[PDB]
Design a protein around this ligand. Structure first.
Ligand SMILES: Nc1nc2c(ncn2[C@@H]2O[C@H](COP(=O)(O)CP(=O)(O)OP(=O)(O)O)[C@@H](O)[C@H]2O)c(=O)[nH]1
Ligand SMILES: Nc1nc2c(ncn2[C@@H]2O[C@H](COP(=O)(O)OP(=O)(O)OP(=O)(O)O)[C@@H](O)[C@H]2O)c(=O)[nH]1
Ligand SMILES: Nc1nc2c(ncn2[C@@H]2O[C@H](COP(=O)(O)OP(=O)(O)OP(=O)(O)O)[C@@H](O)[C@H]2O)c(=O)[nH]1
Ligand SMILES: [Mg+2]
Ligand SMILES: [Mg+2]
Lengths: 31, 183, 19, 430, 427, 430
């Protein structure tokens, strides 16, 4: 049903979120 | 939809939900207001204050300190109306900018924060704050990832594939973190 | 799909617990 | 000397006080216009040339019940500033009576009470009539009792309250209120006389043969109990019992001060001609489960300390006889760490009879106050009721909307739980 | 002291308020000119809850009569007990709303509502300690429904901590008189959900049943219907106006009969209601009062209580009665009908008692029910609403007066949500 | 206030106006010379000393019909300025009344109507009475409604029309005009009560038992419908219906405003005795196929919304009962998207009876105005006749000579075909 593709899109969302959050810090950390 | 109470809490931690400090801003104790997942199944107005203030602060800073200047922390009842009228109008604007992607905001949901109707508004609110930060912290060369996420796909195979790409990105980037902090 | 779901959420919660 | 100040809060307390003051006036020969054509000193103050003004204070956050008294037959008795009334009632809300509607009247009633105390030279203690299930009688009484405890301190605060019945109840949010006020009765009271209305209904319909009794009958009965309690200050007898020595004998540990009251003989004037109401007969009718003022089973627990207040034509020899018989009853069992478990006060003045009452004119009367563990059962049932409603957080928006917290709900429930457990523990033997 | 300011709007509301003022004036002993002529002194104790006192020992009702057609103002002024009302309180328009909600709410009512707010500000500041408002209106038209809704919104904005009662009459599917009734009913319910404290849902079909079956009136009129409604209206506030053995004001009833904020829709009822021929065969006692009041064929709203569960019930008794009788009877009702009562609320019934019986009777009883079966009342409307809105029939009047389609969507969705809440708590 | 200005155009209109004004004068007690030895305020202005001048404006392109008025019994009623006339008629020509001759006299009647509208403070709208068959009543009425819509804007315009008969036609070019008039009645009117003469002939000869009736009987019936429409304005009753209420409940979509009007009971004097014309019977009569004022079968369509105007001795309960019975009938079927489809108005004033009239005296009357798709059939048949004559270009030169184009005929044809298609669509269920 839709509830599982919503689960997938939500987890994709969380992956994208946390990844960008740690990227913006690591780019700062390496410089 | 149990995962709605689940992904919310995870997404709550996604914004960096620390039950201690966010309870400390309100000047109240934690033992009297439980946080976590099973916090909005019943009327729970204190957890409502806390999560709503954190969620409005994570998205905006200056205007948040403005519209919630004469309200927070709404400990009394004369100043409580200020909170309930400053938050409802904002949520109504947010829902009108997105439309069908949001539940219609009703002030009555704020008279008793609880039940599935409040959890629905809360999950869509969390989604909105996540997305409007994926709109700002993702690179100018990658802003499309935001709208690529607003594209409500309907087929499961492509959803599988998108998760697949994102999770390999997750593994590689967490591995590069180790490389950078150790080397 | 559920397997990727589980690996996902687990890595999420445990990496959140990193200081 | 030996004065006392009565505080009547809420509608229940105000009406119970109507009954009580009619009784004291008839007892002492004082007319409802004040004049009397000594002992009255324990309740009345002699104002100039023959005017005995009661040492009481009537309160309500609502104008109606006090207005009945201002326009009633006793208007010339109470002096106008004793009757304090608000504007809008607590409306069955602990939070309103305590936090929002309550804070506007508190200094006024406190100023009146202080002016009342500056007139008495041997103040014994306060008597606080109220009701657990109401809004004012719960919240405003909590507030008043806390403030009184701060100001006066070591004075003995005795409260007579209308505890909610198991099945018969008049309000819906009642359990909620009854729990929160417990958080006060543990700390800011010295002895709490809880009385249920359903038990007095059963008493009336069994003893006095009144099929349809109203609140006035029940209030007359409660008033009689109060009169029997304070007679030892107002009269002379063979064995007097003060309030301090009474509290010394009746309360074994600080937390345990919730005794049961029971009056006897309560019979109609008609079955009275056939009864031979000896000292033994009324002494024993006190120990029956059907003559209880609260719905509980004294058989279901063990007694800890009993006080027998005899009134009228009573000699000590037959009191000793009756107490020895009760000692030889196995259905009446006692704790073991109270080898002697009886205080006896004997008084000379028989119990007066109000015109238009249901009780007859009898020569001997007993008021027995018994600290038993069985009272725990009562609390138990009410707690259960709470945990139904609170499970849904029903009606809680009214409370939290009025300056409350949910933490206070949780704390009141935890407190009542610890009280029950302390009772169960003190009951057990060694 | 706990003053109540009354507000009428529309033909239905105006006539029902007129009956209300007739009966209440009879209660306190006011004659058609305002001159007190009663016997007991109690009648003057709290006359001020409804009546201002003008110079020369005359009493004027604290009521605001509103409408959009002057015909109703003339009709009310010309009736009996018509000369009591202040002339400065008749706020009327000049056209009428034409059963159009958009006209009452946005176009003409919006222009008239300022005069009404001015009059209610004057009356409310005139009073010592206000306790709330009473809006008597109908939901089917344009003036009543939409105008009273705009008025309720503004009032709540100005006095947020007061009580807000409504004796709104709802449409009924059988006895329908207007084609566009579902639209107005839905659009008004949407706002009554938010801006009122307790809504007493009456229904003309139910009153017709009360009159036809119980009173056995061969040809009932609107007078008899308005009489029943006014009986309930005064029965609610007897305790405000008269002493008793267990008082109960409006905030007491609000705190007791409403478990959650949104569930404030009640159905009223009255007892005793007998015919004339059947009168001498009846024992006026407390058991008969309670048996009649808890019957389903006696409710003033066309919803069967047997289809839901009483979340809460309030009984206001009037007369010299025993409290043992009252309480035994309430417990008996609850125990015999244990299935019609929810389980997470013990003791669903609140009872109050006033010492003064109504005009002519020795005792009476008023009944207020917060029940889940009221959801039926809304489902009906919703069905009808959808059946029209799907095709967008009659929508161009509402649109040409400035409304939107998004507003109809929101109104439907809110009515559905209220129905879902009630059904959820029914279990 | 609540005034309405009734424009009577063309011969048919002027004669239906003679009837209507006879009726109103006799209704409000206003004598034929204007004197009355309130309600009249809707249809009369009170000028000077007890003199009432009707708020009507009689127009015609021919003087004789207006000259009979000026010489008749009501010469003292309409002050001369309102009876506007030209010199030559349009001779059953749309192009003459609309372009050729109407342009010379549109301004005169417009000045007069502006004078009339200025004197009223609560204008409700206009009541245009005309025929579709003639040159004035089609052409000049179209021109007049166009200018009035430009001038007055949102004022509601209710037109009462004499539509041609399916069988009995007195004119030959009639369909042509009756088609061109459509292009106006769609856009510039708000409600159009078309009425066919043949149906009133049949109603007369059957219900009233009038062997051979003339135009005076027909005009009497039409005037009765008009008075029943405006009764809720002039007098007071149980449920009241303005003009805007009428239009709101009766018109589902803009293009759909052609309701059928019918009356009950129209019996003889002799037949009225044996019948008990209660509410149920007259309400069932309004729904009978043979009592319509226009020739069509209401069984062949679906009702969209119907307004019942009851008049006289009418209580609401039996109105409700009769309507419920109408609902539980199978032959009266309703469209689905209109589940509640009955408007009800109840007026207290019974219907008056003109002397020398054909109708009897009744205590209850009903005017039913129903929107049913069946009316489409009417247009169909007439359209066919159009499609016949336009097949041969007959009589077209008379139009082209005076400034008309054949494109205009083709355009009216397309417009009426679109209107038929709209009715066929709105009929269908989901
Ligand atoms: N129980 C009663 N119902 C009434 C009464 N009068 C009217 N009604 C019903 O109310 C419904 C419509 O009420 P209203 O006439 O007030 C509509 P309103 O005037 O408020 O808006 P507009 O008239 O369209 O401007 C309709 O069903 C009436 O039958 C009454 O006196 N009592
Ligand atoms: N024995 C007895 N019980 C009463 C009396 N009056 C009220 N009660 C009971 O006490 C409880 C209600 O207490 P109330 O006095 O009504 O509450 P309150 O003190 O007025 O607080 P408010 O709600 O603000 O009025 C119910 O059990 C009532 O039945 C009385 O006169 N005698
Ligand atoms: N029902 C009814 N129809 C009439 C009446 N008078 C004329 N008609 C009909 O109306 C149609 C003709 O319209 P007319 O009014 O005669 O034409 P006109 O308005 O004078 O316009 P011109 O032809 O230019 O004179 C025919 O059906 C006539 O029979 C009447 O009094 N009652
Ligand atoms: Mg109206
Ligand atoms: Mg002509």
């Amino acid at each position: 049903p839709e509830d599982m593709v919503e689960m997938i899109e939500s987890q994709t969302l969380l992956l994208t979120y946390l990844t960008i959050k740690m990227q913006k810090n690591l780019f700062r950390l390496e410089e | 939809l149990a995962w709605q109470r689940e992904h919310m809490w995870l997404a709550l931690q996604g914004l960096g939900f620390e039950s201690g400090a966010e309870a400390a801003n309100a000047g109240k104790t934690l033992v009297h207001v439980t946080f976590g997942v099973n916090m909005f199944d019943k009327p729970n107005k204190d957890a409502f204050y806390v999560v709503f203030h954190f969620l409005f602060g994570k998205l905006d800073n200056v205007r948040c300190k403005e519209v919630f200047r004469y309200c927070w922390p709404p400990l009394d009842k004369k100043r409580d109306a200020e909170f309930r009228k400053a938050c409802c109008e904002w949520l109504k604007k947010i829902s009108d900018e997105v439309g069908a992607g949001f539940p219609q905001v009703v002030a009555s949901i704020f008279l008793s924060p609880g039940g599935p109707k409040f959890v629905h508004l809360l999950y869509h609110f969390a989604r909105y704050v996540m997305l409007q930060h994926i709109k700002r912290d993702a690179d100018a060369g990658n802003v499309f990832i935001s709208e690529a996420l607003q594209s409500k796909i309907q087929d499961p195979q492509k959803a599988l594939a998108r998760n697949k790409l994102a999770r390999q990105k997750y593994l590689k980037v967490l591995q590069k973190e180790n490389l950078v902090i150790e080397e | 799909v559920v397997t990727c779901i589980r690996e996902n959420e687990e890595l999420l919660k445990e990496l959140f617990s990193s200081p | 000397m030996r004065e006392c100040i009565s505080i009547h809060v809420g509608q229940a307390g105000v009406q119970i006080g109507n009954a009580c003051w009619e009784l004291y006036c008839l007892e002492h020969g004082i007319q409802p216009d004040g004049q009397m054509p000594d002992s009255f000193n324990t309740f009345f103050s002699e104002t100039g040339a023959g005017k005995h003004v009661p040492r009481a204070v009537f309160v309500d956050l609502e104008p109606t019940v006090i207005d009945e008294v201002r326009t009633g037959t006793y208007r010339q008795l109470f002096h106008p500033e004793q009757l304090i009334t608000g504007k809008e009632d607590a409306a069955n809300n602990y939070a309103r009576g305590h936090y929002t509607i309550g804070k506007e009247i508190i200094d006024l009633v406190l100023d009146r009470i202080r002016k009342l105390a500056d007139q008495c030279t041997g103040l014994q203690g306060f008597l606080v009539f109220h009701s657990f299930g109401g809004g004012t009688g719960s919240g405003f009484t909590s507030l008043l009792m806390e403030r009184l405890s701060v100001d006066y301190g070591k004075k003995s605060k005795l409260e007579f309250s209308i505890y909610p019945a198991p099945q018969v109840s008049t309000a819906v949010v009642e359990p909620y209120n009854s729990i929160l006020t417990t958080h006060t009765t543990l700390e800011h009271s010295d002895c709490a006389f809880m009385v249920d209305n359903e038990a007095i209904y059963d008493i009336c319909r069994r003893n006095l043969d009144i099929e349809r009794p109203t609140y006035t009958n029940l209030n007359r009965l409660i008033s009689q109990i109060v009169s029997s309690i304070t007679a030892s200050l107002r009269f002379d007898g063979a064995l007097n019992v003060d309030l301090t020595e009474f509290q010394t004998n009746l309360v074994p540990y600080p937390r345990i001060h919730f005794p049961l009251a029971t009056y006897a003989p309560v019979i109609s004037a008609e079955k009275a001609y056939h009864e031979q109401l000896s000292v033994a007969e009324i002494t024993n009718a006190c120990f029956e489960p059907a003559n209880q003022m609260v719905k509980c089973d004294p058989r279901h627990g063990k007694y800890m300390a009993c006080c027998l207040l005899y009134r009228g034509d009573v000699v000590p020899k037959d009191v000793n006889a009756a107490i020895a018989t009760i000692k030889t009853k196995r259905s009446i069992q006692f704790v073991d760490w109270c080898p002697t478990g009886f205080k006896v006060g004997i008084n000379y003045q028989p119990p007066t009879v109000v015109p238009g009452g249901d009780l007859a004119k009898v020569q001997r009367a007993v008021c027995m106050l018994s600290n038993t563990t069985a009272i725990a059962e009562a609390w138990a049932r009410l707690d259960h009721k709470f945990d139904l409603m609170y499970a849904k957080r029903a009606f809680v928006h009214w409370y939290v909307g009025e300056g409350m917290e949910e933490g206070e709900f949780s704390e009141a429930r935890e407190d009542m739980a610890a009280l029950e457990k302390d009772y169960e523990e003190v009951g057990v033997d060694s | 002291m706990r003053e109540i300011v009354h507000i009428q709007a529309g033909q239905c509301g105006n006539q029902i308020g007129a009956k209300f003022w007739e009966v209440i004036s009879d209660e306190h002993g006011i004659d058609p000119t305002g001159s007190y002529h009663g016997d007991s002194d109690l009648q003057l104790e709290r006359i001020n809850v409804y009546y201002n006192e003008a110079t020369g020992n005359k009493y004027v009702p604290r009521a605001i009569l509103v409408d959009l057609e002057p015909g109703t103002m003339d009709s009310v002024r010309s009736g009996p007990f018509g000369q009591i009302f202040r002339p400065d309180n008749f706020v009327f328009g000049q056209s009428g709303a034409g059963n159009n909600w958009a006209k009452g709410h946005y176009t003409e009512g919006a222009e008239l509502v300022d005069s009404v707010l001015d009059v209610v500000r004057k009356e409310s500041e005139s009073c010592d300690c206000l306790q709330g408002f009473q809006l008597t209106h109908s939901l089917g038209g344009g003036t009543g429904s939409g105008m009273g809704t705009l008025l309720i919104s503004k009032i709540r904005e100005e006095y947020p901590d007061r009580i807000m009662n409504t004796f709104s009459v709802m449409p009924s599917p059988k006895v329908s008189d207007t084609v566009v009734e579902p639209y107005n009913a839905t659009l008004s319910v949407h706002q009554l959900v938010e801006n009122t404290d307790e809504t007493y849902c009456i229904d003309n079909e139910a009153l017709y049943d009360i009159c036809f079956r119980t009173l056995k009136l061969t040809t009932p009129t609107y007078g008899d219907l308005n009489h029943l409604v006014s009986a309930t209206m005064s029965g609610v506030t007897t305790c405000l106006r008269f002493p008793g053995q267990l008082n109960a004001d409006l905030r007491k009833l609000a705190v007791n009969m409403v478990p959650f904020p949104r569930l404030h829709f009640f159905m009223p009822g009255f007892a005793p209601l007998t015919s004339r021929g059947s009168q001498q065969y009846r024992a006026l006692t407390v058991p008969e009062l309670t048996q009649q009041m808890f019957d389903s064929k006696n409710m003033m709203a066309a919803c069967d209580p047997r289809h839901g569960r009483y979340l809460t019930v309030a009984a206001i008794f009037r007369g010299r009665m025993s409290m043992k009788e009252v309480d035994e009877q309430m417990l008996n009702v609850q125990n015999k009908n244990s299935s019609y009562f929810v389980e997470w609320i013990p003791n669903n019934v609140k009872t109050a008692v006033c010492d003064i019986p109504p005009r002519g009777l020795k005792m009476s009883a008023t009944f207020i029910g917060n029940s889940t079966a009221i959801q039926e009342l809304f489902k009906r409307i919703s069905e009808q609403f959808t059946a029209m809105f799907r095709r967008k029939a009659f929508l161009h009047w509402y649109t040409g007066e400035g409304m939107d389609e998004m507003e109809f969507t929101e109104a439907e969705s809110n009515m559905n949500d209220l129905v879902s809440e009630y059904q959820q708590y029914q279990d």
